[PDB]
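During the second year of the project, the team shifted from modelling isolated chains to modelling whole assemblies. The rationale, set out in the original proposal, was that interfaces cannot be judged from single-chain predictions alone. As a representative example for this report, we include one of the complexes processed in the last quarter. Its constituent sequences, exactly as entered into the pipeline, are reproduced here:
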Amino acid sequence: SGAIYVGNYRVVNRHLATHNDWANLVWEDSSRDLLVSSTTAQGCDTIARCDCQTGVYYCSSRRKHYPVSFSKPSLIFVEASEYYPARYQSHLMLAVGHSEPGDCGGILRCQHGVVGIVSTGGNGLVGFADVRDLLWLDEE
Ligand SMILES: NC(=O)[C@H]1CCCN(C(=O)[C@@H]2CCSC2)C1
Ligand SMILES: [Zn+2]
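Output from the structure prediction step:
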């Protein structure tokens, strides 16, 4: 579990969104595994606006932050699960690292701010949903 809290927005994995998220919806995209809902309180996270390919992510199944090298946001095949049929998830970045069920929502960050959230794992790989292109998260 986990979210990004920037301005009056809450960014979560679409497959983990709550009823309150859907009832206060700003934007969602199944192909990216992202959903954004509105918040009453202002958040403290800042979004990175950069092309970093190195950063640090939080792994809840290890209670640890790990430094990783990750690929550029791309269209990657994701195996069928209880949450989506086999498909291609867009704007996904892969790294070598531990990710298992319970880990979606952990933040990936760089020197500039939050880069994205854990969206996949298994096989010694971790996949992150990028948010750096969502410029509207920084305003209104
Ligand atoms: N982004 C996806 O399609 C996710 C949905 C949940 C299932 N996915 C996973 O990778 C599992 C949970 C973390 S380790 C294995 C794919
Ligand atoms: Zn950066």
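Residues 48, 50, 52, 110-112 surround zinc ion (ligand 2) (CB under 6 Å). Residues 18 and 24 are 10 Å apart (CA to CA).
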